[PDB]
């Protein structure tokens, strides 16, 4: 949603499987949803509607 | 996921036989026409709706093996 | 069957990283608590048949209508089958309690419960009363950490049962 | 796709797709700048609630 | 993955039987031996960085080739990915040490990497004495016992250098 | 992935003629007689948790190494695949009863399950005695007359056991 | 392939439950269908070829400047396999009518069809012409039901050409 | 929202992009033919549905009666009045998915959460399984050919939601 | 996936040594004759359409059974695979053109085509001499010296019948 | 920030379930274990000059090039800079001891650290030099339990840094 | 490696559809780019050794502090390293003279850059101020075209560098 994805927080070895492409961008997708600082950022504030 | 029974990931190996080709062109290639053989790594947790998803898609499995034990 | 190790582990796992104070702190924190959990254990362990027993006349009591011939509970392969599952309950806490974490309880039997429990016909209460005999008993079996960790994993197990 | 970034769909006819998604991500895109962090207050109040809400009456 | 007591919970579970008093006196033992073991982890964890800053740069000491060209990380891009590959293993080593077993090492990282190293045609005896210099530098690190409390650590010793020793043998 | 309908015109099809009008008496007729595997179907469908009941009770009671400690069906998750495999394996049975052709059959996940289960170390035979419960029962089910007049059905048991019998040699 | 029955099976197949009320009455509404068009079918091909060749010279008689030097149709060898389309076109007719639904035509000639004809360059409305000619015939040939099938196939027939 | 044919069929056919087809229409063709049984099935039931349910509630007193003892749940006049006006709750939803010809009707408005309220408040589904089955078995006798069999199939799908 | 330019540079890093001189000359040989393969190549794609219309007619005159029932491409879908099939393989065929070298074609299509097409059951010989019609109609096309400056393009046609005959070669 | 409170209560809230023993027991942990980093926190706190005029002078020794004219250090202002960051840095290690983990830490240096560093051309080293010669004082100040856990959130400052 | 025609196959195979003008016309640059970027590599080939060896001496010079004994500046084989080193980086960039791409130099030197840099101590402003010697020398040695893109592409190298 725009926020500024800061670099410390990204996963080096998901990015690096990707890389090799053992997952597709789909499995990708779905390990970065289960990074903590997605729910920081939108299950932390948010209500479970917004 | 962190269970024993969530561990033990199974690699799949699909085929895009004929049914799945005939299913996406009726469908529409909305997405690049992939290879026939590709492999996909699929955990326990998600391994049914995998062999699910292949079958509504009318693909069928090559073989699966277990990644851990 | 899951460890606070277990999920410490997986956690760094997905993150991709080492472990930092917070999972140390864990780490030590579930092993202090291993000892007296082992302890309690061991102690449900040690009455396992007289808690068997006691869960088996503590369902005939409870509810009136499971003795009675032609009905669930009535029958000698039954009555085995409800030893066999009362031990596995308990077995299971002692599991979890040697893990230190739910995780046992929670794979072993929670998962996959209630739609077993509904097709084969097993009413939840019975179980929730065989496990309030557990609490019973295992209140007088320990005092201190060892009944406190004994009594979180039976109540959890009732709560999942539940 | 299994290989396509996710995009933004809205503002474009989705097959079979209702008539309010086109209203209500209208009203929640707002422009490149709209980040939804903690702050900005606009990523915590769910604004398309009032809307959603016209949708099961009629 | 999993740890030594979820392998005993296990076993147990399967002959149905429950943990015997031994099997809880020696997880007691690990209990009360955990705080060593967590000790030696932290020494891991805090020096792996360094350790494996130094393990690399004797690994080129040794082993000049693979930076000059027709190497098989000659390139930026492989010898960065010998880099973090050795990163991963050290990393998932001290998993399975600070898990007192080993099987949550194989589960994730020593289950498909041998296949990936052979097909790319990667020379894993490399690879091996990049991991068992992961070792030299753990015993160099771990003997430390500076600002830390003094006692035995021969469990420990014995312990990481079956994980190193595993992991080196899936590997190659 | 056809129906018999489709069956028979995908021969036509691949003669290069129009069809022939035996093919269109039978066809007809399949369309009579589709009251009755409706019928049939519809009563399988409700008496599906009876029918898997009752197989999956005797399974258990004439077998007790799935339930001891470390049986394919005890840790009580194993035995909930167990009552899920059989009862989509009788909804694909079902599924072939009112498509009228076994060749749909195969194509969903009969040309992948055997590797499947010998992948994941399932008993093969056990599965089919499972089905084979599942299939008598469906029967007794079937001969259940309530609320409705009498007519034939035993072509639709043939059929019935046509279509089991081939899910269990393609399960095992 | 998706004949009524064939979607109702993917309907079902696509989440868990069993075949409900709703499919089950489709079913047995397309099976008493499955007359009158039998009926439609069958008189159909009673009438081959009469009514292909038929077809073909009213194409001509409808559009006559390409029957001049610039048909694609043009001389014998063409004309005769611009009878063999038109008798391809009444086989998928038979087969759908049979069939309960649009599965012969949307899965073999309705698949990939625009492209096709751009490549070939065939204009369409010379075969929507020719099923014109066919609703001609039919709003003769049969009646009730087997008629009112028989058109509504051939009317996606036309939409599909379009 | 409720799911029927015609608009299941709606949903279905602006799903793919698509106007309605041979199939959609004949589906729609026999909803409407076999609307007029399931209409003498809704009001023959909405005839005599006082023997129904007070039957049903003396049938469910019959099976379990324990339930009935004091110091159980189902003891009271309180509880009396609760069974009787959610049998007769029963009843008009059944009656509804008969009229809509779907069972949508009734999974909107009881299959959704239903399983929650019977753990919740103890309400084991045996007894109303009985309630359902006791009014089978007097409709067995009150409809007759296509409306008997349409009456049992959704009342049947009440008591597999129960089940 | 090379071209002549990124393959000589690999085998420059290979030797890692500089470019010799000469291989540094056949670069500007083909880049100043590079224009020429560009009009080509851009012939090609501007006269592609009718060129697959033209081969696909030689191809129904030459064989009749595929357009009767039960042939590869009888059905309209199998048949409009067919032709987009020419188009993709003579776009390869246009790809490694542009680029000068084979392997482009080689790892992006053949190895899964080999197998793709095995599976398929067509007739690999038949597919090959299809390349050849469409070889034919692209070297007719080729040969047109339509709209543009005279000049040598000898090697040009040669190569371009090699890019074909490769492609033939290993679809066969 | 990232309090081990405040994982249990996210991961709990997660999964859409109530909190159990294992989290209790981590809570635990953490409450008996703050009392030592407390004690931390209070030898950090009356020691925060030293520790910065160590830390700088230190940065003097090893780098004495870098307050030479042209380069960062030169400058009286620069070096009142220094001070104010390696104080930061100290007062986010007192909010890590005092929050049993690295939360306020990472949210307040780390997130956007390397970033900084590129841009005013900011070493990590010299603040690896800083952290450590904090180390080696912290050797001196503080023992046992409060040493050993002042000093894992040094050293993990430290490791962030390289 | 990539260079622009690689872009334009790799594009027009992922839409899959045939080559239009823009593509082309960047053939075109490319061949016409050619020829300068044909007479930098020779000069680049022509004057490598003085070229690595005034970097060596140059980076000594503007950092002196490296030079002297106890860090990396000193020990024979550290420049014997940086000297192998300066040959590889300037050889890529012949490369990417003549592929007229970043595509050799990117994924031969610049993947991985930042974590070797700080996983050896090597710092980069070191091969930063190397490439800045190379620009010395090339502001005199090339001219004209090749002069502009060979500076283009060292640039980039120290981009990637920063
Ligand atoms: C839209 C972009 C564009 C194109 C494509 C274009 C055509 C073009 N092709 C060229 C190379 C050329 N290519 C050919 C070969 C051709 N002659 C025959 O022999 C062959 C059938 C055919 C090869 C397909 C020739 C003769 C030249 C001109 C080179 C010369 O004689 O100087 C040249 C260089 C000649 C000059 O400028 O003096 C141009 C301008 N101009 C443009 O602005
Ligand atoms: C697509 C084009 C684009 C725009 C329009 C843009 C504005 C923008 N500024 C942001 C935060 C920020 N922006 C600034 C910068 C301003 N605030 C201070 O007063 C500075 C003096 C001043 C800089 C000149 C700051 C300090 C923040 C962090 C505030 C916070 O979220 O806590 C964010 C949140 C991004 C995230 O963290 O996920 C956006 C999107 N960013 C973009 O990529
Ligand atoms: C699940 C988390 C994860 C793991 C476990 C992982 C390991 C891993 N190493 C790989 C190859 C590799 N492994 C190495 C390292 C070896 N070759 C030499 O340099 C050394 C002697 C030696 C290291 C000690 C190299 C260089 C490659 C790729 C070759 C290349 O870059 O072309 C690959 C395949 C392609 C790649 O991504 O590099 C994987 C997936 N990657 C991950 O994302
Ligand atoms: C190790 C994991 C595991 C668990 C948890 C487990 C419980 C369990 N007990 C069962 C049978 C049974 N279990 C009971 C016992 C219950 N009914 C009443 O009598 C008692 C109040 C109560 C016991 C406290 C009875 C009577 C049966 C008979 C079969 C039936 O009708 O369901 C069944 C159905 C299949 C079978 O075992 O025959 C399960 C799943 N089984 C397992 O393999
Ligand atoms: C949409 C779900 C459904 C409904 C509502 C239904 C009711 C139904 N089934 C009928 C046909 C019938 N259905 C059966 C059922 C057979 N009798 C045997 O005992 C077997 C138990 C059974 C399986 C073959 C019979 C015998 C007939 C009459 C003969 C015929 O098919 O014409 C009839 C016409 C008979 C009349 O009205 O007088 C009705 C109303 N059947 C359904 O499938
Ligand atoms: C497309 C439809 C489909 C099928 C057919 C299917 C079969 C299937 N059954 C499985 C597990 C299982 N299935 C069974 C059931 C068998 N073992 C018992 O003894 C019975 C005799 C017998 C039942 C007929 C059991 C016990 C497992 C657990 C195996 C394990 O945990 O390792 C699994 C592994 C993942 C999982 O479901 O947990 C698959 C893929 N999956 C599907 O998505
Ligand atoms: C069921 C699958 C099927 C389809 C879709 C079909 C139509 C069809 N029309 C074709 C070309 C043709 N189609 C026609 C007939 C048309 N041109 C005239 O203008 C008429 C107005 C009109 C007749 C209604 C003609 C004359 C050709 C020859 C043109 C050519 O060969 O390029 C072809 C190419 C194969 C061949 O040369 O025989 C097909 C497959 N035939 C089939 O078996
Ligand atoms: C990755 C790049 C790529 C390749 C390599 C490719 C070839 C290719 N042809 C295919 C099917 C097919 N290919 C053909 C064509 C053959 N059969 C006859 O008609 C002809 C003699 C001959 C063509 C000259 C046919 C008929 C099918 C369908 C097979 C069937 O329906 O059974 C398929 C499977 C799915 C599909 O794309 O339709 C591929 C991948 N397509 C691509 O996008
Ligand atoms: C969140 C609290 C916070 C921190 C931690 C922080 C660090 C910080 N120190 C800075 C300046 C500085 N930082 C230093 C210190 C380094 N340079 C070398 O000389 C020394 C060896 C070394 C000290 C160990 C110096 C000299 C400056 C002034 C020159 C500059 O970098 O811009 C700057 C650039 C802006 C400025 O202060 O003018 C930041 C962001 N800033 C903050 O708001
Ligand atoms: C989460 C916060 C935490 C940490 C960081 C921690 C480490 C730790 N380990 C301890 C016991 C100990 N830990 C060690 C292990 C170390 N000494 C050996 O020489 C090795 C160098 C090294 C192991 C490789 C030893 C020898 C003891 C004392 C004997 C014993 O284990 O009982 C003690 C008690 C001594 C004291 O309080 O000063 C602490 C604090 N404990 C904690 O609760
Ligand atoms: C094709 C990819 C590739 C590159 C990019 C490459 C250059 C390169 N040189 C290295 C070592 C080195 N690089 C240098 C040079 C630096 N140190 C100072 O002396 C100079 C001022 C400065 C030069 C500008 C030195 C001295 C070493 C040895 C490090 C050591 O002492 O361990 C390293 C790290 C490996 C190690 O530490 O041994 C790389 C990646 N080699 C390659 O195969």
Same mark, same amino acid.
């Given at each position: ?9 990204? @996963? ?10 053992? &997952?597709?961008?789909?499995?990708? &997708? ?14 932390? @504030? ?5 | ?69 | ?38 302890? /309690? ?77 509904? /097709? ?43 | ?58 | ?172």
């Amino acid at each position: 949603g725009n926020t500024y994805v800061m670099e410390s927080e990204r @996963p080096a070895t998901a990015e690096s499987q990707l890389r090799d492409g053992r &997952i597709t961008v789909r499995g990708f &997708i779905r390990l970065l949803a289960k990074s903590d600082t997605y729910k920081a950022r939108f299950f932390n @504030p948010a209500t479970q509607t917004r | 996921a962190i269970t024993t029974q969530g561990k033990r990931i199974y690699k799949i190996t699909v085929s895009e036989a004929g049914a799945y080709a005939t299913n996406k062109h009726r469908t529409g290639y909305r997405a690049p026409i992939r290879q026939s053989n590709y492999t996909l790594t699929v955990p326990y947790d998600r391994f049914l709706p995998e062999m699910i998803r292949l079958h509504q898609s009318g693909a069928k499995i090559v073989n699966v093996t277990s990644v851990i034990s | 069957s899951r460890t606070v190790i277990t999920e410490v582990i997986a956690t760094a796992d997905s993150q991709g990283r080492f472990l930092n104070s917070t999972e140390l702190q864990a780490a030590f924190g579930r092993f202090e608590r291993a000892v007296p959990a082992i302890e /309690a254990a061991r102690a449900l362990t040690k009455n396992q048949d007289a808690l068997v027993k006691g869960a088996v006349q503590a369902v005939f009591k409870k509810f009136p209508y499971v003795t009675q011939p032609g009905e669930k509970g009535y029958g000698d392969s039954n009555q085995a089958k409800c030893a066999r599952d009362i031990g596995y309950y308990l077995r299971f806490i002692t599991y979890s309690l040697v893990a230190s974490g739910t995780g046992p309880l929670d794979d072993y039997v929670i998962a996959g419960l209630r739609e077993v429990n509904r /097709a084969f016909n097993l009413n939840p209460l019975w179980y929730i009363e065989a496990l309030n005999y557990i609490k019973g008993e295992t209140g007088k079996l320990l005092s201190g950490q060892s009944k406190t960790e004994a009594l979180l994993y039976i109540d959890h197990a009732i709560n999942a049962l539940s | 796709g299994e290989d396509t970034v996710p995009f933004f769909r809205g503002f474009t006819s989705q097959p079979g797709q209702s008539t309010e998604a086109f209203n209500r991500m209208v009203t929640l895109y707002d422009g490149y700048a709209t980040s939804d962090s903690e702050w900005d207050r606009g990523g915590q109040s769910a604004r398309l609630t009032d809307s959603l809400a016209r949708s099961t009456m009629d | 993955m999993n740890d030594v007591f979820t392998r005993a919970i296990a076993q147990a579970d399967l002959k149905g039987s429950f943990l015997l008093e031994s099997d809880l006196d020696k997880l007691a033992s690990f209990a009360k031996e955990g705080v060593k073991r967590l000790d030696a982890v932290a020494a891991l964890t805090n020096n792996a960085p360094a350790i494996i800053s130094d393990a690399a740069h004797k690994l080129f000491a040794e082993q000049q080739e693979l930076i000059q060209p027709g190497g098989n990380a000659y390139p930026h891009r492989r010898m960065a990915a010998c880099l973090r590959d050795m990163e991963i293993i050290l990393r998932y080593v001290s998993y399975a040490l600070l898990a007192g077993d080993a099987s949550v090492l194989d589960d994730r990282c020593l289950n498909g990497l041998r296949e990936t190293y052979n097909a790319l045609g990667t020379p894993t005896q490399s690879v091996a004495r990049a991991v068992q210099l992961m070792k030299d530098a753990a015993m160099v690190h771990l003997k430390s016992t500076a600002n830390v409390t003094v006692g035995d650590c021969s469990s420990l010793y014995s312990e990481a250098a079956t994980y190193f020793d595993k992991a080196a043998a899936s590997i190659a």
